[PDB]
Amino acid sequence: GRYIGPVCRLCRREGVKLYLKGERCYSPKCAMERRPYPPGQHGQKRARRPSDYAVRLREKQKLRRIYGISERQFRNLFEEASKKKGVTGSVFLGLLESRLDNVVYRLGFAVSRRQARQLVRHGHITVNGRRVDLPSYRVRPGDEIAVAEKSRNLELIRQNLEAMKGRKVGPWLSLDVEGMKGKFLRLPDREDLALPVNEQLVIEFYSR
């Protein structure tokens, strides 16, 4: 049970806009709209020049809270990375962005990640045919990520794809709104991702 509870206070703590709700966090109400100061009884007071540790920290809780993963699943992937050939940095993201519960977000099947986490749980998604209710499942290059046949008829899902009619997809994905299907072309490269992050810092945090 990772977090689950108030979100926008997270958005307000990192000081940057986080899309942890899909809709709304777009219309005048993600709080960061006329109230970008942190939560608590001192969110409005003045902030003191952060410690090298504070920055590295804040920057992590960001990268992570965007995907809503336990610091646990978070870490272990970091390691996976560290070990793989390539720039620790992006290699990290690549994987992070390879999570089914996530891919289901990018492909649009759901308004945002958390919801996608769920859809995966309740078995409304499929990979190569055999459904998968596992959020942390790593999508490999060449795997169709379709909607559960018995789910293609749910209002919520139809609603989602209905509005995708037009929304382009990451050049590392592609979908077939008709057959409500969509492939994972290839691991998205750091550029391809527009994250308000500085993974050169997350990295630095786990170097302590």
Closest approach of Cβ 17 to Zn ion, in Å? 7
Q: Which of 16, 17, 73, 187 binds RNA (CB under 7 A)?
A: 73
**From the CB of residue 72, how many other CB atoms can be counted at a distance below 10 Å?**
9
Span near Mg ion by CB under 5 A; candidates 1-9, 87-95, 130-138, 172-180: 1-9
Q: Which of 36, 112, 138, 185 binds RNA (CB under 7 A)?
A: 112
Closest approach of Cβ 185 to RNA, in Å? 24
Nearest to 132 by CA among 116, 155, 153: 116
- With respect to RNA, which residue has the nearer C-beta, 45 or 167? 45
Closest approach of Cβ 84 to RNA, in Å? 8
* CB-based contact 142:97 (threshold 8 Å): no
Q: Is 73 helix (H, G, I), strand (E, B) or coil?
A: helix
Site for Mg ion in 57-76 (CB under 5 A): 61
Position closest to Zn ion via CB: 11
Q: Which of 2, 17, 158, 190 binds Mg ion (CB under 5 A)?
A: 2
Q: Is 20 in the site for RNA (CB under 7 A)?
A: yes
Closest approach of Cβ 189 to RNA, in Å? 16
Enter the DSSP assignment of 138: B
Any idea what the Cα angle at residue 110 is, between residues 144 and 120, rounded to 5°? Answer: 60
Cα torsion angle, 77, 69, 187, 181, sign? positive
Q: Is 8 in the site for Zn ion (CB under 5 A)?
A: yes
Q: Which of 14, 30, 102, 104 binds Zn ion (CB under 5 A)?
A: 30
Q: Is 110 in the site for RNA (CB under 7 A)?
A: yes
Choose among Mg ion, RNA, Zn ion, none what residue 141 binds, the Cβ cut-off being 5 to 8 Å by kind: none
Which helix or strand (DSSP H or E) is residue 174 part of?
A: strand 174-176
Place of tokens 């560290």: 82
**Residue 201: partners with Cβ closer than 8 Å, 6 or more residues away:** 55, 56, 59, 60
Closest approach of Cβ 142 to Mg ion, in Å? 25
State the Cα torsion 103-105-108-112 to the nearest 10°: 180
Binding characters for RNA, 132-161, by CB under 7 A (x = yes)? --xxx-------------xx--xxx-----
